[PDB]
Amino acid sequence: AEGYEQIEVDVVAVWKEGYVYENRGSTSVDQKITITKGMKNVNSETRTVTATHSIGSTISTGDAFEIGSVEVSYSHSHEESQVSMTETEVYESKVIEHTITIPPTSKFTRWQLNADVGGADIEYMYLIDEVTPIGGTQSIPQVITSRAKIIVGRQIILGKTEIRIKHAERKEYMTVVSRKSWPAATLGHSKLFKFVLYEDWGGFRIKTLNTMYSGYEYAYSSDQGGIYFDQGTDNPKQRWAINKSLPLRHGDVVTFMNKYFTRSGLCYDDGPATNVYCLDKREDKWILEVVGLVPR
Ligand SMILES: C[N+](C)(C)CCOP(=O)(O)O
Ligand SMILES: C[N+](C)(C)CCOP(=O)(O)O
Ligand SMILES: C[N+](C)(C)CCOP(=O)(O)O
Ligand SMILES: C[N+](C)(C)CCOP(=O)(O)O
Ligand code: NA
Ligand code: NA
Ligand code: NA
Numbered sequence: 001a002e003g004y005e006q007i008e009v010d011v012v013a014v015w016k017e018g019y020v021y022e023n024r025g026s027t028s029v030d031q032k033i034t035i036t037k038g039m040k041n042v043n044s045e046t047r048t049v050t051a052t053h054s055i056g057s058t059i060s061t062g063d064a065f066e067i068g069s070v071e072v073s074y075s076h077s078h079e080e081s082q083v084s085m086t087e088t089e090v091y092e093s094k095v096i097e098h099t100i101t102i103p104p105t106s107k108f109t110r111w112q113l114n115a116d117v118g119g120a121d122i123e124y125m126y127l128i129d130e131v132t133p134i135g136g137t138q139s140i141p142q143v144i145t146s147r148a149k150i151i152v153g154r155q156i157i158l159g160k161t162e163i164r165i166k167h168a169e170r171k172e173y174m175t176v177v178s179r180k181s182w183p184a185a186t187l188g189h190s191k192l193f194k195f196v197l198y199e200d201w202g203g204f205r206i207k208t209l210n211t212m213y214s215g216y217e218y219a220y221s222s223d224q225g226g227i228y229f230d231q232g233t234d235n236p237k238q239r240w241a242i243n244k245s246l247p248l249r250h251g252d253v254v255t256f257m258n259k260y261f262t263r264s265g266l267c268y269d270d271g272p273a274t275n276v277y278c279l280d281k282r283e284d285k286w287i288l289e290v291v292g293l294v295p296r
Contacts, residue, residue: 003289006068009148015112015113015141018035018112023105033097035095051065069084069085069086069148071084073144074144076128090117106133109138156252159198162195170187174286176229186275202259203240203259211229218233221278225277226274236259242256265282
C-alpha cells in the first residue's frame with residue numbers, strides 16, 4: 001500500500017484447556033463439539049486494529065497497525081511443527097463443528113491455541129486434540145517461537161517529513177487562505193497543501209509550506225477560536241497536543257488540543273469565512289498523510 005510498510009515482531013501465544021470429556025464407564029459415548037476459530041470482537045468495517053498493549057519497541061498502546069501474518073511454532077508429541085496464518089485467516093471467524101467418539105476408560109483433550117498480537121486475541125488459531133487412557137500420561141503442547149508480521153504507516157520524522165492533514169469525517173484537506181490579512185486554515189479538496197510537524201519543550205507545532213505572508217507559518221488559535229498562522233514564538237497559543245504516542249505515522253488518526261486554551265481542540269465549524277476552529281470540550285479526528293512525489 002502507498003505509504004505503509006511490513007515489520008516482523010515477537011507476539012505471545014499459549015495452549016489452553018479448551019474442552020475436556022471423561023468417559024469412566026462403558027460403552028463408547030458420542031458428543032457434539034463446536035469451536036470458533038477467529039479474532040475476538042473483530043471489526044467488519046476495517047482491518048486496522050488499535051493496540052490495547054505494546055508489541056516491543058515498535059508498537060505502543062493506541063497505535064494503528066494491521067496483522068499481515070502470524071507464525072507460531074509448537075512441540076507435540078515429542079516432535080516440532082509450525083503453523084502459519086494469512087491476513088484473511090487472522091480476520092475470519094470459522095465455526096468448526098463435529099462429533100467426537102470417546103472410547104471407554106479414555107479422556108478426550110481438545111487443546112486450544114491462541115495468540116495475543118498487542119491486544120488482538122486470536123481464539124483457536126489451531127486445534128490439536130488428544131485422546132489418551134485414564135489415568136495415563138498425555139503430551140502437553142508448548143509454543144517454541146511465536147512471531148507476527150504487522151503493517152504500519154511510514155514514519156513521520158518531526159521537523160523533516162512533509163504531510164497533508166485531512167479531516168476524517170468530511171474527507172477534506174486542511175488548506176491555507178487569507179483572512180483579516182493573516183494566513184488562515186480552512187477545509188478544501190486541494191492536495192497541494194503541505195505541512196511539517198515540529199516538537200519542542202512546549203508541544204507540537206503545525207508549520208505551513210503554503211503561506212502567502214512570509215514568515216507567518218505556525219498554526220495558532222485566536223481568542224475567537226479561528227485558526228491562523230503566526231511567526232515562530234514561545235507562545236503556547238501556537239502549540240498543540242497530540243493524543244497518540246510517538247512515532248507519528250502515515251494514516252494516523254489524531255486530535256490536536258491547544259496548549260493555551262487547554263480543553264479546546266481543532267475541528268470543523270461553520271465560520272462566516274473559513275471553517276477550521278479551536279472549540280472547547282470538543283476535538284475532531286484528522287488523518288496525517290505522508291506526501292507522495294511531485295512529477296518533473
Ligand atoms: C493433531 N491431531 C489430533 C489431529 C492428531 C494428533 O493426535 P495425537 O498427537 O494427540 O495422538
Ligand atoms: C469571529 N469568528 C468567531 C467567527 C472567528 C473569527 O476569529 P477572529 O478572526 O475574529 O480572531
Ligand atoms: C469554541 N468555543 C466557543 C466553544 C470555545 C473555544 O474558544 P477558543 O478556545 O477556540 O478561543
Ligand atoms: C519573552 N520572550 C520574548 C522571551 C518570549 C515571549 O514569547 P511570546 O509568547 O510573548 O511570543
Ligand atoms: Na526542545
Ligand atoms: Na501566537
Ligand atoms: Na463556512
